[PDB]
Amino acid sequence: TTEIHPSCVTRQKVIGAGEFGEVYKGMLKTSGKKEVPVAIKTLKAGYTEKQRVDFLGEAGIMGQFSHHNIIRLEGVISKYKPMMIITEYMENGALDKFLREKDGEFSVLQLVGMLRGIAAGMKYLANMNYVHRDLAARNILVNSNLVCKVSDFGLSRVLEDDPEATYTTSGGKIPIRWTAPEAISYRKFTSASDVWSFGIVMWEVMTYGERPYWELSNHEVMKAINDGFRLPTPMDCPSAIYQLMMQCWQQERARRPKFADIVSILDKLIRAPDSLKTLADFDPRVSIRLP
Numbered sequence: 190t191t192e193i194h195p196s197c198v199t200r201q202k203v204i205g206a207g208e209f210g211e212v213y214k215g216m217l218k219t220s221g222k223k224e225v226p227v228a229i230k231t232l233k234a235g236y237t238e239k240q241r242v243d244f245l246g247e248a249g250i251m252g253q254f255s256h257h258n259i260i261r262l263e264g265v266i267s268k269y270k271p272m273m274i275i276t277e278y279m280e281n282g283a284l285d286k287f288l289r290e291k292d293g294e295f296s297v298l299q300l301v302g303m304l305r306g307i308a309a310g311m312k313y314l315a316n317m318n319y320v321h322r323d324l325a326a327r328n329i330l331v332n333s334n335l336v337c338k339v340s341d342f343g344l345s346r347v348l349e350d351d352p353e354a355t356y357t358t359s360g361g362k363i364p365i366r367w368t369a370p371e372a373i374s375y376r377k378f379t380s381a382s383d384v385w386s387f388g389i390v391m392w393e394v395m396t397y398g399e400r401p402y403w404e405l406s407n408h409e410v411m412k413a414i415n416d417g418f419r420l421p422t423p424m425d426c427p428s429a430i431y432q433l434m435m436q437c438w439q440q441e442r443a444r445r446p447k448f449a450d451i452v453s454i455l456d457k458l459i460r461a462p463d464s465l466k467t468l469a470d471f472d473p474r475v476s477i478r479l480p
């Protein structure tokens with residue numbers, strides 16, 4: 190892992206914060222070249238052994254990856270305190286908030302392109318034998334080219350740190366509305382449970398960041414899923430896209446597409462973009478009648 194001297198890092202603005210460090214936007218000097226914008230996460234003094242292992246472990250995992258749709262690591266400060274992880278800077282931030290702040294501003298083809306990128310990053314991770322466990326729009330980052338990159342890596346720290354992941358009756362901490370039934374029921378997290386999550390992300394993207402299952406409680410979500418109910422079609426959603434998200438939500442893990450199948454289908458739809466003009470029917474909640 191590239192070790193960066195602290196004199197090369199200028200933290201400029203807090204963009205996220207937690208009890209044991211912050212995330213900053215800043216600049217990285219890498220004498221001749223212009224400084225480059227970066228994101229910087231810190232780990233403050235007094236950290237425990239487990240915190241150090243988890244913090245640097247995220248950097249270690251990220252350093253094993255080289256893919257357009259996976260956040261790129263610039264390096265770490267580990268020889269000086271506070272320790273830091275430095276990555277590329279994603280100008281548009283988290284995908285969930287981005288979509289909610291840009292409601293209706295993109296074309297269907299742009300939205301599907303975002304899903305293609307996410308799927309390519311997930312195919313890469315699954316092929317690398319990395320199970321994400323927390324795939325959700327809140328853990329995707331977006332740059333000024335609209336490229337979506339998978340974020341949030343690690344072992345126990347991922348679900349521990351995400352406030353959407355809640356303690357269950359069985360004792361595990363999981364983000365219920367994004368998690369496959371086998372992962373909820375018996376702690377079985379695999380690339381196929383990540384495919385379930387990806388289907389939820391597809392729904393998030395096509396609804397501009399609606400909250401999955403709206404106000405249903407976590408218990409009610411699990412009950413509906415076990416009863417066979419599934420999220421309904423977003424408004425303005427290509428039929429092929431809704432069909433694909435439905436396949437991701439098969440109860441039987443073995444029936445779900447693999448990420449390779451998802452990427453292939455999304456590629457083909459984008460290459461023949463008229464295919465996206467055929468929309469799934471939308472079930473209205475409200476009737477407007479006028480004579």
Ligand SMILES: Cc1cccc(Cl)c1NC(=O)c1cnc(Nc2cc(C(=O)NC3CCNCC3)cc(C(F)(F)F)c2)s1
Pocket residue numbers: 204205212214228229230247260274275276277278279280281282283330340341
């Ligand atoms: C530094 C680091 C360590 C370990 C793992 C990772 Cl993935 C990282 N890298 C990062 O966290 C980030 C890389 N790019 C980021 N861009 C970003 C940018 C912003 C943000 O300041 N700007 C945009 C400008 C204001 N409009 C909305 C978003 C906000 C966030 C969020 F709130 F989410 F934190 C993120 S965060």
